[PDB]
Amino acid sequence: DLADLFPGFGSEWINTSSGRIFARVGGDGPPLLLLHGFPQTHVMWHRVAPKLAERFKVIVADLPGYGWSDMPESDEQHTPYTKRAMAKQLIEAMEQLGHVHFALAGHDRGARVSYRLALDSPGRLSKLAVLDILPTYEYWQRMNRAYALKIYHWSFLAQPAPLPENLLGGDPDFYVKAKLASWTRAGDLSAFDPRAVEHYRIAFADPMRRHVMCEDYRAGAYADFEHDKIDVEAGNKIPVPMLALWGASGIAQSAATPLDVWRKWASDVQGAPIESGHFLPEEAPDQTAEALVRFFS
Amino acid sequence: LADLFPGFGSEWINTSSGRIFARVGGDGPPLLLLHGFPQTHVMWHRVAPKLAERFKVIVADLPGYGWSDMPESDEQHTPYTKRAMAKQLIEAMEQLGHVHFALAGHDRGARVSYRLALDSPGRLSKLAVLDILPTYEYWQRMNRAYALKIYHWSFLAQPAPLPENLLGGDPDFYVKAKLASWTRAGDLSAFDPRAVEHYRIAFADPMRRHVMCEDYRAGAYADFEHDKIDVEAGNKIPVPMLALWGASGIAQSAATPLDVWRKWASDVQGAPIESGHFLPEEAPDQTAEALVRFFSAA
């Protein structure tokens, strides 16, 4: 029923102390971890991972609680779904494969895991690439009418349970499709492989999975923000070489100039726009893969 | 549905934009009461009788709410902008022979009310607004804490049919959650259960829910732009004005309410009431006393 979009990639269930991380694993060479975001699963990398796997051992993981990864029990502080906890859990996952020094590219929520991992444990990363985000602190700091309307879901999904869970249950198929379509350049589903969309839709049809996603956004509104705040106030920067990519018509550019912002957070950052909406690896797979390959090699 | 205004008449007022439904009672100078979201005119049922001892009280459903007709919206949500709603209610009041009247509004109706006083101040003898700041002020203060508090301002303004599709899975849940979450107590205990049934029935209608989202879309766009024109041009409401807010309501979370209203109104007095957002139901005696005192002064 669900198409395998990674021909020749193996499938790994990686055990960690917080649950299993599901991953597709392929390629050969230095390890490169790829982290998806909301409302997607690892399969969003299906068009650029084969090209990365020409030069790297590509590990395409479902975030904790997403996709086929286990869903650790949350708590009042949404702790397991804070970016700090997810980063620790993925480090453990990578340690299970003997990868203690790896490259990392993340998109959306996974990119928030990624830059938090680089702030908390920079020795773990050879190079970091973030796709179409600014730091979570920067979104909340810039919160105004324009961005409240554009990223309303940051405030909506962070409401206390079961308010967003109940409303998402009103038409989950519509919601996940509406999020997919509305953040592309085209404004519809045509930039996606319909088989990938099926993965996203089935993931989003599980009420427990939708609850995890809300826990992620609740963390994003509270602890994740407090963790970012400590670093800005302490002036802590990312020392790992970093690439920031953003869609010309995506989420990040709409609020600021992303490279300008990321230079405040990182000492060595290069950046480039991609002609794309939010979903860089699916709307512009050749451009995204090209820039990732050069940066990572 | 229960009649919560014993002795009040029922009137269907024709206007160019559709019919306005109103309970009418009392005698004396005309006083219009405008509910808000997610309510209907019956939210006034605990204060209207006390008001009706001194005023001809007209308790109207907003255009598109409760039992009033629902004009078809458009790309700019024009009929549900506060400016258009105010014009419709002026038309309605003219059909009753009230070209100069007192006005108290709550929530959305309070937004209609101050917009009315800006566009057509000659129609108002006095104005009371309950637990609101101007729409401009909410958007201007929209930082992280406030975006989380009044998330619904951004969620309901999302383009159709996103909030409509999510609201239709369990409309009872959402309307009761909004009624409950904004009260002091945080449950439905302040409300008359007969009143809650009115609110829940109105909300069960998908066309009514659409209108509410249209209201919120106007509130994010045109309503904002209209207010923006007035603040930046320094236009102030010249009508004697009472700003009432709940100590635990929405207005006070954004800023200090009286301070904000003094930027918008040249003759404003203000008082907190110990209550959540829903002043006339959570604090009916104190609300009614403030309104009677204010409207029967000069």
Per-residue HEC secondary structure of chain A comes to CCCCCCCCCEEEEEEECCEEEEEEEEECCCEEEEECCCCCCHHHHCCCHHHHCCCCEEEEECCCCCCCCCCCCCCCCCHHHCHHHHHHHHHHHHHHCCCCCEEEEEECHHHHHHHHHHHHCHHHEEEEEEECCCCHHHHHHCCCHHHHHHCHHHHHCCCCCCHHHHHHCCCHHHHHHHHHHHCCCCCCCCCCCHHHHHHHHHHHCCHHHHHHHHHHHHHHHCHHHHHHHHHHHHCCCECCCEEEEEECCCCCCCCCCHHHHHHHHECCEEEEEECCCCCHHHHCHHHHHHHHHHHHC
**One-letter identity of residue B199:** Y
Question: Scanning the structure block, which residue is given the tokens 């006393």?
Answer: B289
Question: Scanning the structure block, which residue is given the tokens 């700090």?
Answer: A84
The enclosing domain of B229 has a CATH number of 3.40.50.1820
CB A126 within 8 A of CB A119: no
Name the nearest CA neighbour of B131 among B284, B293, B271: B271
Please count the CA atoms within 13 angstroms of the CA of A171 that sit on its side-chain side: 15
Q: What does residue B195 show for φ and ψ, rounded to 5 degrees?
A: -65, -45
Overall domain count for chain B: 1
Tokens read off for A269: 């950052």
To the question of whether residue A147 is assigned a binding role by annotation, the answer is: no
Name the nearest CA neighbour of B110 among B10, B298, B249, B283: B249
Closest CA of chain B from A83, distance in Å: 19
- Interface check B170 vs A, CB under 8 A: yes
**Which residue of chain B is at minimal alpha-carbon distance from A151?**
B154
Give the residues across from A39 on adjacent strands.
none
| Cβ burial A249-282 (10 Å sphere, 16+ → b, else e) | bbbbbbbbebbebbbebbeebbbebbebbbbbbb
In chain B, what is the straight-line distance between the N-terminal and C-terminal CA atoms, in Å? 38
Positions of A marked catalytic: 108, 278
Q: What is the CA radius of gyration of chain A?
A: 17
Tokens read off for A208: 């427990």
Choose, from B35, B210, B226, B277, the residue flagged as catalytic: B277
CB B277 within 8 A of CB B249: yes
User: How far is residue A239 from each of residues A123, A225, A265, A296, B292, measured CA to CA in Å?
Assistant: 9, 20, 9, 16, 66
Name the nearest CA neighbour of B278 among B247, B241, B255: B247
Choose, from B61, B107, B131, B215, the residue flagged as catalytic: B107
- Interface check B224 vs A, CB under 8 A: yes
What span, in angstroms and rounded, lies between the C-alpha atoms of A14 and A94?
8
What span, in angstroms and rounded, lies between the C-alpha atoms of A173 and A178?
8
User: How far is residue B265 from each of residues B20, B140, B222, B235, B237, measured CA to CA in Å?
Assistant: 28, 18, 21, 8, 4
Q: What is the CA radius of gyration of chain B?
A: 17
What span, in angstroms and rounded, lies between the C-alpha atoms of B269 and B282?
21
Examine residue B161 and say whether the peptide bond preceding it is cis (omega within 30 degrees of 0).
Answer: yes
Neighbours of B100 (CB within 10 A): 11
Tell me, in Å, the resolution of the deposited structure. Answer: 2.0
How many whole angstroms from its chain centre is CA B288?
A: 16
CB B26 within 8 A of CB B56: yes
Neighbours of A54 (CB within 10 A): 13
Give the residues across from B23 on adjacent strands.
B10, B59
Burial of B246 (0-12, 13-18, 19+ CB in 10 A): buried
**One-letter identity of residue A85:** A
Give residue B232's domain range: 1-298
**Best of B136, B142, B231 to disrupt the A interface by mutation (most A CBs within 10 Å)?**
B142
User: How far is residue A157 from each of residues A40, A141, A164, A219, measured CA to CA in Å?
Assistant: 16, 18, 5, 10
- Interface check A221 vs B, CB under 8 A: yes
Q: What does residue A221 show for φ and ψ, rounded to 5 degrees?
A: -90, -20
Name the nearest CA neighbour of B63 among B87, B42, B45, B47: B87
What span, in angstroms and rounded, lies between the C-alpha atoms of A125 and B121?
65
Burial of B40 (0-12, 13-18, 19+ CB in 10 A): buried
Tokens read off for A56: 């790297």
To the question of whether residue B221 is assigned a binding role by annotation, the answer is: no
- Cβ–Cβ of A158/B143 closer than 8 Å? no
Tokens read off for A106: 């993340």
- Cβ–Cβ of B168/A168 closer than 8 Å? no
To the question of whether residue A45 is assigned a binding role by annotation, the answer is: no
State the pairing for strand pair A102-107/A31-35.
parallel
Residues with Cβ within 8 Å of B259's Cβ and at least 6 positions away in sequence, in order, are none
User: How far is residue B200 from each of residues B11, B16, B66, B176, B178, measured CA to CA in Å?
Assistant: 22, 28, 10, 7, 11
User: How far is residue B298 from each of residues B97, B125, B239, measured CA to CA in Å?
Assistant: 22, 10, 12
CB B62 within 8 A of CB B34: yes
Contacts of A181 in chain B (CB under 8 A): none
Question: Scanning the structure block, which residue is given the tokens 């790297």?
Answer: A56
How many whole angstroms from its chain centre is CA B114?
A: 10
User: How far is residue A1 from each of residues A8, A109, A195, A203, measured CA to CA in Å?
Assistant: 18, 27, 9, 13
What span, in angstroms and rounded, lies between the C-alpha atoms of A25 and A47?
14
Backbone φ/ψ region at B113: left (φ over 0), alpha (ψ -120 to 50), beta: alpha
* Of residues B151, B158, B170, nearest to A159 (C-beta): B151
* Angle in degrees, 0-180, between the axes of helices A194-204 and A207-221, rounded to the nearest 10: 80
Tokens read off for A80: 């397991």
3-state secondary structure chain B: CCCCCCCCEEEEECCCCCCEEEEEECCCCEEEEECCCCCCHHHHCCCHHHHHCCCEEEEECCCCCCCCCCCCCCCCCHHHCHHHHHHHHHHHHHHCCCCCEEEEEECHHHHHHHHHHHHCHHHEEEEEEECCCCHHHHHHCCCHHHHHHCCHHHHCCCCCCHHHHHHCCCHHHHHHHHHHHCCCCCCCCCCCHHHHHHHHHHHCCHHHHHHHHHHHHHHHCHHHHHHHHHHHCCCCECCCEEEEEECCCCHHHHCCHHHHHHHHECCEEEEEECCCCCHHHHCHHHHHHHHHHHHCCC
Tokens read off for A57: 């051992």
What span, in angstroms and rounded, lies between the C-alpha atoms of A284 and B153?
34
**Best of B152, B162, B181, B217 to disrupt the A interface by mutation (most A CBs within 10 Å)?**
B162
User: How far is residue B140 from each of residues A148, B219, B225, B255, measured CA to CA in Å?
Assistant: 11, 13, 12, 11
User: How far is residue A74 from each of residues A80, A97, A289, B115, measured CA to CA in Å?
Assistant: 6, 26, 35, 46
Tokens read off for B193: 């259960």
What span, in angstroms and rounded, lies between the C-alpha atoms of B144 and A222?
10
CB A279 within 8 A of CB A109: no
- Interface check A160 vs B, CB under 8 A: no
What span, in angstroms and rounded, lies between the C-alpha atoms of A151 and A91?
29
CB A52 within 8 A of CB A292: yes
- Interface check B145 vs A, CB under 8 A: no
Name the nearest CA neighbour of B127 among B86, B170, B186, B187: B86
What span, in angstroms and rounded, lies between the C-alpha atoms of A208 and A212?
6
What span, in angstroms and rounded, lies between the C-alpha atoms of B128 and A214?
39
Name the nearest CA neighbour of B247 among B203, B199, B283, B204: B283
CB B156 within 8 A of CB B213: yes
- Interface check A161 vs B, CB under 8 A: no
How many whole angstroms from its chain centre is CA B149?
A: 19
Name the nearest CA neighbour of B133 among B249, B238, B233, B220: B249
State the pairing for strand pair A19-27/A10-16.
antiparallel
Residues with Cβ within 8 Å of A291's Cβ and at least 6 positions away in sequence, in order, are A243, A245, A272, A274
CB B266 within 8 A of CB B117: no
Tokens read off for A179: 């999020």
Q: What are the strands of the beta sheet with A242-247, ordered from one edge?
A: A10-16, A19-27, A57-61, A31-35, A102-107, A125-131, A242-247, A269-274
Give the residues across from A59 on adjacent strands.
A25, A33
To the question of whether residue B83 is assigned a binding role by annotation, the answer is: no
Give the residues across from B12 on adjacent strands.
B21
Backbone φ/ψ region at A117: left (φ over 0), alpha (ψ -120 to 50), beta: alpha
User: How far is residue A189 from each of residues A54, A100, A194, A222, A283, measured CA to CA in Å?
Assistant: 28, 38, 8, 32, 10
What span, in angstroms and rounded, lies between the C-alpha atoms of B292 and B280?
13
State the pairing for strand pair B30-34/B101-106.
parallel
CB A273 within 8 A of CB A248: yes
To the question of whether residue A109 is assigned a binding role by annotation, the answer is: yes
